[PDB]
Structure formats: C-alpha cells, structure tokens
Amino acid sequence: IIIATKNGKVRGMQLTVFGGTVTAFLGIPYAQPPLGRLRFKKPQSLTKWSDIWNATKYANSCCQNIDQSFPGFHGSEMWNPNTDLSEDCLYLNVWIPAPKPKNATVLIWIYGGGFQTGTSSLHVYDGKFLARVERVIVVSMNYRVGALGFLALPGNPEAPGNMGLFDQQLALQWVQKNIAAFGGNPKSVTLFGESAGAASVSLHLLSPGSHSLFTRAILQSGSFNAPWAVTSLYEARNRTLNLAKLTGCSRENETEIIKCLRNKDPQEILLNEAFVVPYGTPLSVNFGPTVDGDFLTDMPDILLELGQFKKTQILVGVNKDEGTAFLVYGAPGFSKDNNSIITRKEFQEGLKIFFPGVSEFGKESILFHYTDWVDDQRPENYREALGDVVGDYNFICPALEFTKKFSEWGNNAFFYYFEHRSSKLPWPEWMGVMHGYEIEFVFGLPLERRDQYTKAEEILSRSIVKRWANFAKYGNPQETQNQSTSWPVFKSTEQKYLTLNTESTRIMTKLRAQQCRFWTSFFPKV
Numbered sequence: 262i263i264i265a266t267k268n269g270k271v272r273g274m275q276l277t278v279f280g281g282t283v284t285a286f287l288g289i290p291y292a293q294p295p296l297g298r299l300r301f302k303k304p305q306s307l308t309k310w311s312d313i314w315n316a317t318k319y320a321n322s323c324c325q326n327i328d329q330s331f332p333g334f335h336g337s338e339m340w341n342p343n344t345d346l347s348e349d350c351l352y353l354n355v356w357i358p359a360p361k362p363k364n365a366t367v368l369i370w371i372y373g374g375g376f377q378t379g380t381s382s383l384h385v386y387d388g389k390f391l392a393r394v395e396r397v398i399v400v401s402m403n404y405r406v407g408a409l410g411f412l413a414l415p416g417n418p419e420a421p422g423n424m425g426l427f428d429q430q431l432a433l434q435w436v437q438k439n440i441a442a443f444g445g446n447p448k449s450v451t452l453f454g455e456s457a458g459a460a461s462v463s464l465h466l467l468s469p470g471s472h473s474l475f476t477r478a479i480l481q482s483g484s485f486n487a488p489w490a491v492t493s494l495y496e497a498r499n500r501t502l503n504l505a506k507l508t509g510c511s512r513e514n515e516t517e518i519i520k521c522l523r524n525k526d527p528q529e530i531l532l533n534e535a536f537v538v539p540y541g542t543p544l545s546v547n548f549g550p551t552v553d554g555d556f557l558t559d560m561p562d563i564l565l566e567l568g569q570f571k572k573t574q575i576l577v578g579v580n581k582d583e584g585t586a587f588l589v590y591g592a593p594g595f596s597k598d599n600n601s602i603i604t605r606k607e608f609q610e611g612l613k614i615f616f617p618g619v620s621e622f623g624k625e626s627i628l629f630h631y632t633d634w635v636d637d638q639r640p641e642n643y644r645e646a647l648g649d650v651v652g653d654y655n656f657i658c659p660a661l662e663f664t665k666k667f668s669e670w671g672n673n674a675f676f677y678y679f680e681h682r683s684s685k686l687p688w689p690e691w692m693g694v695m696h697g698y699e700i701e702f703v704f705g706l707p708l709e710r711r712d713q714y715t716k717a718e719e720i721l722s723r724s725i726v727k728r729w730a731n732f733a734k735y736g737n738p739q740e741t742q743n744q745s746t747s748w749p750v751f752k753s754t755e756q757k758y759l760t761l762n763t764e765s766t767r768i769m770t771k772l773r774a775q776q777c778r779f780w781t782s783f784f785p786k787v
C-alpha cells in the first residue's frame with residue numbers, strides 16, 4: 262500500500278475494477294508549488310519529506326478560466342475542472358496493476374484544453390481501466406495553463422515562457438527517477454495526449470531535453486504545426502505587455518513588470534487574459550508555447566522540415582468532425598439546440614469569425630474551395646462546409662502534414678481516422694464525431710458495462726485499447742488475435758490510414774487530399 266520514492270514514501274488506495282484490483286496514487290507532488298516568487302518561473306525541484314504522503318485523492322487543478330457557455334449541460338461541463346483551482350497544482354497520478362507488475366510499459370497522458378484549461382482528474386482521463394485490462398501503468402500530470410504557464414518574456418528567467426511544458430517535462434523526469442519503484446519500466450514510456458495535449462507530445466519530440474525521458478508517442482487530434490499551437494514571439498511580447506497594461510503593471514524594467522504581476526491575485530491575471538488579443542476567435546490561444554531558446558530552440562516548422570526530432574515510432578489520428586464543436590462558440594446562426602441550417606451569408610460571416618485578420622481575398626478563396634457543391638440545393642451545405650473548414654484547417658491537415666514530414670525520415674508512423682459517434686453523446690447529431698470524443702474510447706470507459714454504452718462500442722473500445730497498448734509496448738498498433746484488419750505504416754507516397762468505427766474497419770489512402778493541398782500549400786501564402 263506504501264511505495265518508497267526518491268523524495269519520500271507515498272500511500273495509495275485499492276480500487277475494484279472488473280472483478281480485479283488496481284492500485285491508484287492520486288495527487289503525488291512532483292515539484293515545488295510555484296507560488297510567490299516562483300510564479301511564472303520554471304518548476305523547481307521538490308525537497309524530501311519524512312512522513313507518508315497520502316496520495317488518495319486528486320489534487321488541485323491549476324488556475325484557469327472556466328467555459329460557462331452552457332451551464333448545467335454535460336457536453337461542456339464534462340471538460341470543466343472537478344477539483345479546486347489553486348496555483349499549488351503541480352501533482353501527478355499513477356495507476357498500477359494489481360498484483361504489482363514486474364516491468365510494465367508506462368503510458369503518460371497529457372491533457373489538452375487550448376493550453377488555457379484542462380486537468381488530469383477528468384472522468385474521461387481515468388487510467389484505472391487501461392491498468393486493469395492491459396497491465397500497463399498509467400501516469401498523468403497537472404501542468405500550468407494560461408498566462409501562469411506560458412507568459413513569455415524571452416530570455417528572462419522570471420518569465421521565460423513554456424513553463425507549463427517544463428511542468429510536463431519535470432513529471433516525465435519523475436517517472437524516469439521513480440516509476441521502477443512502482444513496477445514500471447522507465448525504458449518503455451509512451452506519451453499520449455489529445456488536442457493541446459497532442460501538440461504538447463509533438464513538442465517533446467522536438468525538445469532535446471525531453472529526448473531521454475520517453476520512448477514512443479501518440480498524438481490524438483493535435484500537433485505543433487496546427488495554426489493555434491505556437492504563439493509567435495511578436496504576439497507573445499504584445500500579449501505580455503497588454504496584460505501588464507490591463508493590470509496596472511506597465512513598467513520599463515521588464516523584470517519589475519514581472520514582480521508587479523507576482524503581487525496580483527490569481528483571479529485578476531485570469532480575468533485580463535481574454536482581452537490581451539484584440540480580435541479573438543473560438544480557437545484563440547492567448548498564452549501558449551513560444552520559441553523560448555530553451556525548451557524550443559528554433560521555429561518548430563524548421564525543425565520538422567529538416568529532421569531535427571527524436572527518431573521513434575508515432576501513432577497519429579483525427580476525428581471525422583473535428584471542427585463542429587467550435588461553431589457553437591461564436592459562429593452566427595449556429596446552436597446546439599437546433600439543426601443550424603445556415604445560409605451563404607451566415608457562412609461568410611462565419612469566416613469573418615474564424616479568420617478575422619485574414620484578407621478579403623483569403624476568405625473568398627476558402628469560400629471558393631468549400632462551396633463547389635455536389636448538390637446546390639441541400640439546405641445543410643453551408644453548415645457542413647464551415648465545420649469542415651474549421652476542422653481541416655485547425656486539426657486534420659496539420660496532423661496529416663506532421664505525419665508525412667515525420668515519416669520521411671525513416672520511422673514507422675501509423676495514422677487513424679476515428680468516425681464513431683458515441684451513443685451517449687450529449688451534443689446534437691449534426692455535430693457528428695466531435696473533437697475530444699475518442700478519448701473515452703482510448704481510456705476504455707465503454708468496457709464498463711454499467712455505463713449505457715452499446716455492445717458494439719465495448720468491442721471497439723476493447724480493440725482500440727489493445728492497439729494503443731501494443732503500440733506502447735511494441736511499437737506496432739496491431740490487434741493480432743481476433744482476425745482484425747492489419748494497420749499499415751503511413752508512408753508519404755501511399756499515405757494509407759486506418760478507419761475506426763463499429764461497422765467496417767477499412768484501409769483507405771490520402772485523407773482529405775484535395776482539402777489539405779489548399780490549406781497546406783496555398784493558404785499559407787495569403
């Protein structure tokens with residue numbers, strides 16, 4: 262029940278899962294609380310304790326604004342933090358199989374939330390099912406988000422940027438130093454993450470200081486080359502300065518600006534984060550990763566293009582309707598409570614919302630590419646077009662490009678297209694296979710027969726869980742036993758991918774070929 266770690270003993274707790282047992286250590290601290298003079302700095306090392314730390318409940322989530330767009334609605338509130346917010350939030354969680362494994366592969370989860378939100382204690386991130394079913398160890402950590410995790414004054418150690426990424430990296434280090442005492446294998450560590458968590462995973466593939474801290478990587482609906490994932494050094498300075506003005510902290514000595522921000526209460530930094538950008542969109546990332554000269558030594562597109570990244574296997578994928586979620590967070594004519602049949606003029610207004618700083622010609626060119634109808638009379642033509650615009654631009658085409666460029670250097674890559682709409686999905690049917698709604702399948706929640714999932718969804722989750730665990734253990738996401746479709750490597754020439762659904766699991770080629778040539782080759786010019 263008690264494990265001796267390098268910094269002290271921790272006590273866990275037994276859980277009953279599927280007529281078996283999983284041992285959970287929830288809320289192990291992995292860094293000095295980043296409080297007081299430590300706000301905005303890289304995370305400092307933890308000094309030992311002599312007692313027994315009680316890791317029996319999730320710890321505080323990091324400070325963050327909350328999505329209040331749909332109070333009482335499970336489809337949005339399932340993503341909101343479910344422990345107290347606090348600056349004292351640098352904790353991690355460990356689920357280990359019972360009986361204690363001898364040398365188990367480790368899966369480390371990095372949550373998303375646009376780098377402004379998220380917490381590892383969400384119900385859909387519960388590691389106990391993977392530990393029970395596949396006898397892997399699951400680790401997840403809280404890392405700082407928003408300005409408190411990514412405020413950037415480049416070169417200045419008082420606020421260097423990328424602190425939340427260094428939070429993640431310090432937790433990977435904790436697993437290297439400590440997971441063998443839990444029965445884990447530090448030489449067999451796979452990172453997995455979704456959305457900004459997947460963008461985070463991809464940046465660890467680029468960061469030389471993370472290279473020795475993991476083996477393989479899984480990227481679910483995200484990568485660093487997505488247009489929302491990396492803040493420019495220009496915007497980062499303008500945003501840090503605007504935050505200073507907003508809080509009466511404008512100074513000329515930049516270090517004195519940080520000292521002033523260190524005396525504001527967390528809630529007043531949070532309230533001014535929104536307005537540091539003049540025209541925001543539903544995908545705005547106020548404070549995110551930057552090229553800091555430390556974690557990130559050059560523009561990541563250059564590093565990707567020139568093969569400067571960890572050479573290992575990757576698993577990458579996207580969902581069929583990545584873009585629809587964002588339409589109900591600002592696009593005119595849209596509502597989760599009706600079928601959102603919009604007109605051409607609403608479509609055009611919708612592009613102004615998603616591409617506010619883009620030239621008139623740029624917006625026309627999106628319209629031109631996405632309105633060549635196979636039928637001009639379908640009432641939902643425009644509703645679907647805007648969704649595909651948002652999802653192709655922001656998730657699908659960047660993930661396909663990352664996979665192509667990464668595989669060109671000789672590593673096995675595997676790409677999936679997830680197209681199952683959850684039977685339990687609280688959002689309306691027109692929104693489809695939404696961003697974030699593969700996660701519960703990856704974590705094995707449909708394996709729990711009590712929870713109203715269909716039988717077909719148990720089978721699909723069961724096969725996904727097996728493929729993810731085989732990728733982490735062996736670098737190869739096959740299900741070898743139940744006459745399953747074999748998953749081929751993704752090569753830049755043939756570009757084969759695997760579709761994931763309850764019906765027919767098929768091999769297909771060149772996902773969104775025509776749409777992505779527009780986003781990837783032409784649109785960057787406008």
Ligand SMILES: *[C@@H]1O[C@H](CO[C@@H]2O[C@@H](C)[C@@H](O)[C@@H](O)[C@@H]2O)[C@@H](O[C@@H]2O[C@H](CO)[C@@H](O)[C@H](O)[C@H]2NC(C)=O)[C@H](O)[C@H]1NC(C)=O
Pocket residue numbers: 363364446448449450476733734735
């Ligand atoms: C636990 O297992 C490791 C081997 O891990 C495997 O090899 C990795 C390279 C990676 O591909 C993982 O996914 C694999 O599961 C053992 O590591 C060995 O350690 C000895 C130490 O003397 C070393 O000489 C060997 O070269 C290591 N093997 C490899 C393949 O590098 C480790 O000893 C095992 N520990 C326990 C307690 O079982």
Ligand SMILES: *[C@@H]1O[C@H](CO[C@@H]2O[C@@H](C)[C@@H](O)[C@@H](O)[C@@H]2O)[C@@H](O[C@@H]2O[C@H](CO)[C@@H](O)[C@H](O)[C@H]2NC(C)=O)[C@H](O)[C@H]1NC(C)=O
Pocket residue numbers: 499502503504506507536537538539
């Ligand atoms: C960079 O920052 C300036 C300042 O932003 C304004 O003040 C901040 C404190 C914050 O409250 C923002 O919401 C404000 O917009 C931006 O310049 C402003 O731009 C808006 C609209 O473009 C304009 O109405 C204001 O008059 C401008 N104010 C000043 C002082 O110039 C600027 O757009 C930001 N972005 C870039 C790329 O420079």
Ligand SMILES: *[C@@H]1O[C@H](CO[C@@H]2O[C@@H](C)[C@@H](O)[C@@H](O)[C@@H]2O)[C@@H](O[C@@H]2O[C@H](CO)[C@@H](O)[C@H](O)[C@H]2NC(C)=O)[C@H](O)[C@H]1NC(C)=O
Pocket residue numbers: 592593594595596598599600601602
């Ligand atoms: C779908 O709903 C949107 C959103 O309107 C709100 O939600 C509805 C479910 C209902 O509760 C309305 O009373 C709410 O206003 C509708 O978009 C609005 O349309 C009106 C006129 O068409 C326009 O003046 C508003 O600005 C629109 N609001 C927004 C936020 O864009 C839309 O018309 C509905 N579509 C249908 C019923 O097909």
Ligand SMILES: COCCN(C[C@@H]1CCCN(Cc2ccccc2)C1)S(=O)(=O)c1ccc2ccccc2c1
Pocket residue numbers: 326327328329336337340374375376377378456457489543544545546586587590695696697
């Ligand atoms: C208080 O925070 C306001 C801003 N964000 C809220 C999210 C906006 C999108 C919807 N999320 C809920 C949700 C619904 C449906 C399916 C999944 C998820 C809430 S955010 O900071 O979290 C954010 C920012 C920029 C991102 C860019 C790319 C992808 C995700 C992003 C999230």
Ligand SMILES: *[C@@H]1O[C@H](CO[C@@H]2O[C@@H](C)[C@@H](O)[C@@H](O)[C@@H]2O)[C@@H](O)[C@H](O)[C@H]1NC(C)=O
Pocket residue numbers: 315
């Ligand atoms: C940490 O927890 C210790 C033990 O808690 C008790 O025993 C275990 C087996 C569980 O059954 C738990 O629910 C019980 O409450 C306490 O004795 C100790 O005081 C705790 N330490 C602190 C600092 O709170």
Ligand SMILES: *[C@@H]1O[C@H](CO[C@@H]2O[C@@H](C)[C@@H](O)[C@@H](O)[C@@H]2O)[C@@H](O)[C@H](O)[C@H]1NC(C)=O
Pocket residue numbers: 723724727740742743
């Ligand atoms: C594989 O299928 C199991 C149920 O099917 C039965 O068992 C397999 C091994 C075959 O012999 C088949 O003819 C049987 O009908 C599931 O219980 C099991 O979880 C599945 N495994 C995976 C990884 O999906």
Ligand SMILES: CC(=O)N[C@H]1[C@H]([C@H](O)[C@H](O)CO)O[C@@](O)(C(=O)O)C[C@@H]1O
Pocket residue numbers: 321345346347
């Ligand atoms: C955010 C925060 O610091 N919460 C703390 C809570 C609350 O202060 C009280 O339960 C009242 O809400 O108290 C603890 O003793 C607990 O019960 O686990 C420690 C925990 O850290």
Ligand SMILES: *[C@@H]1O[C@H](CO)[C@@H](O)[C@H](O)[C@H]1NC(C)=O
Pocket residue numbers: 514515516517
């Ligand atoms: C700014 O302040 C710091 C400490 O408060 C000091 O070390 C530094 O020299 C100052 N620089 C300027 C340009 O005032």
Ligand SMILES: [Cl-]
Pocket residue numbers: 447448449450473474475476
């Ligand atoms: Cl390693």
